Amino acid sequence: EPWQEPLAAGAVILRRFAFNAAEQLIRDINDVASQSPFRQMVTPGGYTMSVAMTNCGHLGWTTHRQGYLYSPIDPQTNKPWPAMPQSFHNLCQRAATAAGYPDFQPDACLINRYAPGAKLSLHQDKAEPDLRAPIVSVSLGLPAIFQFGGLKRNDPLKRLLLEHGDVVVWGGESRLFYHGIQPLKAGFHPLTIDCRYNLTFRQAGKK
Amino acid sequence: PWQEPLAAGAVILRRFAFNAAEQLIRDINDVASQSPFRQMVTPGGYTMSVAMTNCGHLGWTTHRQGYLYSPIDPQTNKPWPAMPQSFHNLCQRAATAAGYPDFQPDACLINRYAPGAKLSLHQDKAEPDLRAPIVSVSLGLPAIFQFGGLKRNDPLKRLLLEHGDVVVWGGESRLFYHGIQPLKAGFHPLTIDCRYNLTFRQAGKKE
DNA sequence: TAGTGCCT
DNA sequence: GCAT
Ligand SMILES: O=C(O)CCC(=O)C(=O)O
Ligand SMILES: O=C(O)CCC(=O)C(=O)O
Ligand SMILES: [Co+2]
Ligand SMILES: [Co+2]
């Protein structure tokens, strides 16, 4: 079934942890996306991102003229983001628990969609005010190479092949570690067809 | 010397700084000879009954302007005195004993309470990195330390903290409400008629 | 700012 | 490493 692969202090890959729940989540990805479509956000410096994005839950990650921000409102629809699906919340809390983060209460889910070539540059998740809360990151569909630092931009990166069902969780000592996804290679998956989805759960607000 | 549970992520290290107390006080005096103890007025207009100074990279002060973490002491227009080795060793030993092996303070606020002096119920919420615990050292006269929950009105535990007692809280109890009741007059051989507290914090960003 | 691209 |  599902196994573990430690990464760094506070960081684990829960291999295939989400494999069983994958269909229900992908279904929910569609339902979220029907309310708040995937869009390729433009960074504050004017770059269009290659990853296409949407959000569900109380707070959604968004780009804005003044920098990267969490908003209760989808500027694409000027409505609040969709409620977080029960399957999202359930899988997430299970993972955070299996990962040794017992009381994770996410208020934010970023949905990433990678088409072939799409990537996400090395970066830290530092837009969140409460650093105690872990990051839970679910991989679905096409395989990708995830790199994992690194408190500095340039200390050794681990390069991990993340497959459909894999969940990476990080936090505590590794909460601000650099990470990213290399240009997605083309392929097929039965459940996602031609792309890779990622679900990043966070506590983006304040307890 | 010994441990007592206080809350999730919080312990009392009874008499933990008893052995080092004489050196800590000498180190207080030296720190004070550069950045003297001073009164502070809060944004409310009330002068605090506690006198304060700081040592370490970042010092906390409050004003009718608002509180401030700064590398400069407003009274001297110079950096706060560097963190004394005794302070740094004791803090780290305390934090490891309390389950926080990686605590690196960059800030120590020194409080001096005279009889009648108090510190109103509050949260330590000014620090951006909430993963770092608070290490809280008692010296001299005994005081009642209030320790509650996340909300202002959550039930309060009245704890009698005595010379050498160290309190450590973090994780789930990190933002818990707490405070000091008006100090009763008394005598202590090492402080005469007053109580010192060392509050160690990570006030800036961790490396 | 840069969650990008090395711009010529 | 750096641009702004
Ligand atoms: O797609 C991934 O696996 C990583 C996602 C990510 O870095 C993010 O959402 O911040
Ligand atoms: O004197 C004490 O033990 C409490 C000090 C405190 O709560 C503070 O400085 O914020
Ligand atoms: Co990220
Ligand atoms: Co306090």
Residue numbers in the entry:
A (entry chain B): 9 to 215
B (entry chain A): 10 to 216
Sentences from the study reporting this entry:
In Escherichia coli, cytotoxic DNA methyl lesions on the N1 position of purines and N3 position of pyrimidines are primarily repaired by the 2-oxoglutarate (2-OG) iron(II) dependent dioxygenase, AlkB. AlkB is a member of the iron(II) dependent 2-oxoglutarate (2-OG) dioxygenase superfamily that couples decarboxylation of 2-OG to succinate to oxidation of methylation damage primarily in the form of 1-methyladenine (1-meA) and 3-methylcytosine (3-meC) upon binding of dioxygen to the iron(II) cofactor. The AlkB enzyme recognizes and repairs other alkylated DNA lesions such as 3-methylthymine (3-meT), 1-methylguanine (1-meG), and 1,N6-ethenoadenine (εA), albeit with lower efficiency. AlkB repairs methylated DNA damage in ssDNA much more efficiently than in duplex DNA and displays significantly different activity on structurally similar methylated bases.
We determined the structure of the full length E. coli AlkB protein in complex with a 17-mer ssDNA oligonucleotide containing a 1-meG lesion to 2.2 Å resolution and the structure of the AlkB holoenzyme in the absence of nucleotide substrate to 2.9 Å resolution. The structure of the ssDNA complex was determined using a D135A mutation of AlkB because our mutagenesis data revealed that this residue is responsible for the specificity of 1-meA and 3-meC lesions. Our DNA binding experiments further showed this mutant has a higher affinity for DNA that allowed us to crystallize the DNA complex without the need for cross-linking as was done for the dsDNA complex. Interestingly, in the crystals of the AlkB-ssDNA complex two monomers crystallized in the asymmetric unit, but only one monomer was bound to DNA. Of the 17 nucleotides present in the ssDNA oligonucleotide, only 12 were able to be modeled into the electron density of the structure. The phosphodiester backbone of the ssDNA binds in an electropositive DNA binding groove that is created by a T51-Y55 DNA binding loop, S129, and K127. The substrate base is bound in the active site pocket formed by hydrophobic stacking interaction of W69 and H131. The methyl group of the 1-meG is adjacent to the bound metal ion and properly positioned for oxidative repair. The O6 oxygen of the methylated guanine is pointed towards the space created by the absence of a carboxylate side chain in the D135A mutation supporting the idea that residue D135 provides selectivity for binding adenine and cytosine bases in the active site. Additionally, with DNA bound and a substrate base in the active site, the Y76 side chain rotates to close the active site pocket.
